[PDB]
Each structure stands twice: as structure tokens, then as C-alpha cells.
């Protein structure tokens, strides 16, 4: 959350329908438009920003909200037209050795 | 690992969009069609309606 990627992806056919079968996601809320109509909207470049938070903090990621992570590590203004895709990864990112 | 849901590692990824004064690149899936024989039909080849 303090060092999150800012992948600037462009020059491709963004097929959001494929993302519904890549990984078992648990959240596909898109604030901007509908995913069906998103496949017909052109864009210059998409900024992919990924991080890892707890479950009870997933609700804190919103276009404008207070919280321990919402305003201290990553904040979204009231113009975010993307999605808040998130998923649990408690299969390979948790070992009993000291995290 | 021996915990419950709610305090587990959840990977959250956002995809911010932008539209500046530059030609767009990532439009989306270009749904094509098949090829018909000689017949009075509509064509939309590369936007040529």
C-alpha cells in the first residue's frame, strides 16, 4: 500500500469480459459505467494500481472516504470511472514463518 | 493461515481511466462479423457506414 504499482497500459484491445474468468475474484464493482458498455468506450491509457489490504478495509476503497488506509496510503477522488476489482489470496501469501 | 475471513490478505486492483487531448488507444473488443456473398446488405467496414 505504500509502494503500489502504476502500470500505464495502452495499445491493446481491452476485453473486460476475459477478466470474469481469469481468477476467482470476489469484487467487480465499477463506479464509472456498466461492464457491458465499457467494452465500447475508447481510452488513451489505463492506470493499473494494485495493493494488499485486509478484508474489513476493502469497503474503505471508495471514490472519497475516510479511513486508516483510505486517506493514508491510497485515496480516490470523486471522479474514478474504473473498477475496484479485488480478491482474496490466502492460498500462497500466508505461511507460518513471521509475516 | 489459521485465521478467519476479514483479516486475510486481500489483493485490490483499481483501473483508473483518463481522457486527455490525445487519440485513444485502448478502445475494447472490435466485434467483427462474417463474409456474405453478393447481396444488398449494410456494411460498416472500419466505420464506413
Amino acid at each position: 500500500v505504500y509502494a503500489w504499482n502504476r502500470k500505464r497500459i495502452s495499445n491493446c484491445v481491452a476485453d473486460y469480459s476475459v477478466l470474469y474468468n481469469l481468477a476467482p475474484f470476489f469484487t467487480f464493482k465499477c463506479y464509472g459505467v456498466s461492464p457491458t458498455k465499457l467494452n465500447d468506450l475508447c481510452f488513451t491509457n489505463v492506470y493499473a494500481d494494485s495493493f494488499v489490504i485486509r478484508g474489513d478495509e476493502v469497503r474503505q476503497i471508495a471514490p472519497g472516504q475516510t479511513g486508516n488506509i483510505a486517506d493514508y496510503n491510497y485515496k480516490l477522488p470523486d471522479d474514478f470511472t474504473g473498477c475496484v476489482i479485488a480478491w482474496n489470496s490466502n492460498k500462497l501469501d500466508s505461511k507460518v514463518s513471521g509475516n | 493461515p489459521t485465521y478467519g475471513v476479514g483479516h486475510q490478505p486481500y489483493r485490490v486492483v483499481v483501473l483508473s481511466f483518463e481522457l486527455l487531448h490525445a487519440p485513444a488507444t485502448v478502445c475494447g473488443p472490435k466485434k467483427s462479423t462474417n463474409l456474405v456473398k453478393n447481396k444488398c446488405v449494410n456494411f460498416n467496414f472500419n466505420g464506413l457506414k
Partner: single-chain antibody
Framework: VLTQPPSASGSPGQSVTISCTGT?????????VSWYQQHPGKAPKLMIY???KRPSGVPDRFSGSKSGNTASLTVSGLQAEDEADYYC???????????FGTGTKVTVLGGGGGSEVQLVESGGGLIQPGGSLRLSCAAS????????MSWVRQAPGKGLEWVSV???????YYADSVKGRFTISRDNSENTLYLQMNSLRAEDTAVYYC???????????????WGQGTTVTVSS
């Protein structure tokens, strides 16, 4: 709502080993269970914050291991003369107040923070029901504008509960008891930080405590310093 024994007086200092059950989980996220020793008169004093690594204080109370689903604070062999109340903290979920427990009478016998930073209050004697009274905890030592402080009220007989939590500069969360009728307003960033009553509902008669550190997400903060409270004494 937690589960704590009403009282504990049999076998003083030999098999007391008070704890706080009623968790039925793994203490949420960060396993930090604190123990507060509320004493009549002066403000309470911190005893232990984690399961181990007791702070600078009495060394005859340690080994607060989490057995089953409850932190069993080993208190045996401490002493045989004490009149206070032990409160445990748990349920570290996001935005969940009332993390304290019920009143546990741990008096082993029954019968038989001052100059650290600062200790000031407003002295609300004979508070008129309603209006707007401001209470401050001006600290000439630690910064009253950068650390994470809190406000906790307690009434005669009833236990403590989270009443106000304020972060560094971007959070003004209120407890579920007020549900909106309480508005926190920060004073000058270099003088003090006060509160506001905002038309109480005859339920704010409890005495207040402005703590320099959080309760459930408690951090070391060098030392835990509290301050004496004042009686509201509403006349509704």
C-alpha cells in the same frame, strides 16, 4: 459486548488468573489485548498491552498468554492488598466501539502520570442540561496535534466504552451512542485540542477521560499517561 466474571475474591493471589471470554474468534487481526487497572479517584494506569513484553512497572504481573479464545492474564503471586477493577480489550474489528468489558471486582483483600506530560481539564461543575460545554486536555509535552488521541467516558457502576476516536488530521469518527449528536472540533494546532457537547441527551452525565493514545489499536507511544476526570452532574 464481552464476557467477564462479575467478581473474583476467592484464593487471593494464588488461583485468581482472571481473563475475558466471549470472543469465539482469533481476536480479529493484530492480537493486542490490553489490560487497564481502573482505580477509584485518580485516572487508571496501563498494566500490559501485548501478550508479553510488559512495560516499565510492577514485574509481578506477566504471562498474559492467549489460551483457547481468551487472554489469561496471570495475576497470581502479585500482592494481597488491592482495590481496583481490571478491564480487558478485544474485538479489534474495523469501526467497532465498546471494546471494553464489564466491571470485574478483582479485589484480593477489599478492606486494605502526574508530572509526565500534563493533566488539565475544564471542571464542568453543575452542567446545565444542553448548551455547549468544551473540555480540553492541553499537553505542554507530547504534541496535541500529531498523535492519535481518544475520549472515553465512564459512569458509576457501568464499565468504560469508546466514545470518541480522532486520527491525525483526516478522521472525525464518532461512537454509536451519540450517532451524530456529537461533533468533534480541533482547537489551534499549537495550543490544545478541545471537545464539544452539542446538546447532550441526558446521557452524557458520565465522567470523561482524554487519553493521549488509542485503546483498541494501542501503540507503545513511549509511555501511557492518563488524566483525572470531572463530574458532569447534569440537572435535566
Amino acid at each position: 459486548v464481552l464476557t467477564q466474571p462479575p467478581s473474583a475474591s476467592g484464593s487471593p493471589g494464588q488461583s485468581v488468573t482472571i481473563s475475558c471470554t466471549g470472543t469465539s474468534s482469533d481476536f480479529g487481526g493484530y492480537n493486542s489485548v490490553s489490560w487497564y487497572q481502573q482505580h477509584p479517584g485518580k485516572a487508571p494506569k496501563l498494566m500490559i498491552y501485548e501478550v508479553s513484553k510488559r512495560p516499565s512497572g510492577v514485574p509481578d504481573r506477566f504471562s498474559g498468554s492467549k489460551s483457547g479464545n481468551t487472554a489469561s492474564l496471570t495475576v497470581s503471586g502479585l500482592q494481597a492488598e488491592d482495590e481496583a477493577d481490571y478491564y480487558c480489550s478485544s474485538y479489534a474489528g474495523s469501526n467497532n466501539f465498546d471494546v471494553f468489558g464489564t466491571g470485574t471486582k478483582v479485589t484480593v483483600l477489599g478492606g486494605g502520570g502526574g508530572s509526565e506530560v500534563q493533566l488539565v481539564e475544564s471542571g464542568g461543575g453543575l452542567i446545565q442540561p444542553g448548551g455547549s460545554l468544551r473540555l480540553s486536555c492541553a499537553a505542554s509535552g507530547f504534541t496535541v496535534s500529531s498523535n492519535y488521541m481518544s475520549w472515553v467516558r465512564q459512569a458509576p457502576g457501568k464499565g468504560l466504552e469508546w466514545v470518541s476516536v480522532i486520527y491525525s488530521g483526516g478522521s472525525t469518527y464518532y461512537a454509536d451512542s451519540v450517532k451524530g449528536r456529537f461533533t468533534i472540533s480541533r482547537d489551534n494546532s499549537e495550543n490544545t485540542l478541545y471537545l464539544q457537547m452539542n446538546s447532550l441527551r441526558a446521557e452524557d452525565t458520565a465522567v470523561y477521560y482524554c487519553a493521549r493514545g488509542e485503546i483498541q489499536p494501542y501503540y507503545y507511544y513511549g509511555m501511557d499517561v492518563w488524566g483525572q476526570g470531572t463530574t458532569v452532574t447534569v440537572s435535566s
